[PDB]
Ligand binder design. Structure first.
Ligand code: E6C
Length: 212
């Protein structure tokens, strides 16, 4: 795998979104991955519906939090609509999939990256954008204004994001707090410090969609 990876440069990442005041981080994260894999597999870059996940993944708790793995299982079993068909409203409403026509895309499965192992995550990332979680509750994470983030931070994961690249000493993450946060809405998190949890516990739980 290359020393530097940036799916943004391969045209496999769509613009940065804002989840607003709805705990929909999990939906956001899952979509970053679907968007990526489709581009990688088909050559088209489409935006997919986070709202669709928010309203339809009954295993998650809407604006109260959720599971990227669950969201991703949903897309593999049923499929998902384009973002314009089912735009984001930042509030949970009934599932309108059928109301909206046939799904735009379907994946084949979901896989877990072996946890607390940097090498395994970098490998996956080299393959496609991956759903990852970290501890975002601390003020330092929140007031992040750019640079290589190194903490301070515990490993009390509570936020789902997506890993879209890496370099020599960091992992490139796409957040969903708007373009006004961090590095134009991205964060470069320090990698290779030997902490098995990963900084902010970045290696606790990572998934990615499978598409034949
Ligand atoms: C992320 C966001 O801010 O949207 C969101 O809070 C999330 O999905 N988070 C995990 C939060 C931690 C505090 C553990 C999560 O908790 N997942 C399930 C949450 C609830 C019990 C409903």
């Amino acid at each position: 795998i290359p020393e530097y990876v940036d799916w943004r440069q391969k045209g496999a990442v769509t613009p940065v979104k804002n989840q607003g005041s709805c705990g929909s981080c999990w939906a956001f994260s899952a979509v970053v991955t679907i968007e990526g894999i489709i581009k990688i597999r088909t050559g088209n870059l489409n935006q997919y519906s986070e709202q669709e996940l928010l309203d339809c993944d009954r295993r998650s708790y809407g604006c109260n939090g959720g599971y990227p793995w669950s969201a991703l299982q949903l897309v593999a079993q049923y499929g998902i609509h384009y973002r314009n068909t089912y735009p984001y409203e930042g509030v949970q409403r009934y599932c309108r999939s059928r109301e909206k026509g046939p799904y735009a895309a379907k994946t084949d499965g979901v896989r877990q990256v072996q946890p607390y192992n940097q090498g395994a995550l970098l490998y996956s990332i080299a393959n496609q954008p991956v759903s990852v979680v970290l501890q975002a509750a601390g003020k330092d994470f929140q007031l992040y204004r750019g640079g290589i983030f190194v903490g301070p931070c515990g490993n009390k994961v509570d936020h789902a994001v997506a890993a879209v690249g890496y370099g020599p000493n960091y992992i490139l993450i796409k957040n969903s707090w708007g373009t006004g946060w961090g590095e134009n809405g991205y964060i470069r998190i320090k990698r290779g410090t030997g902490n098995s949890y990963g900084v902010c516990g970045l290696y606790t739980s990572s998934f990615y969609p499978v598409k034949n």
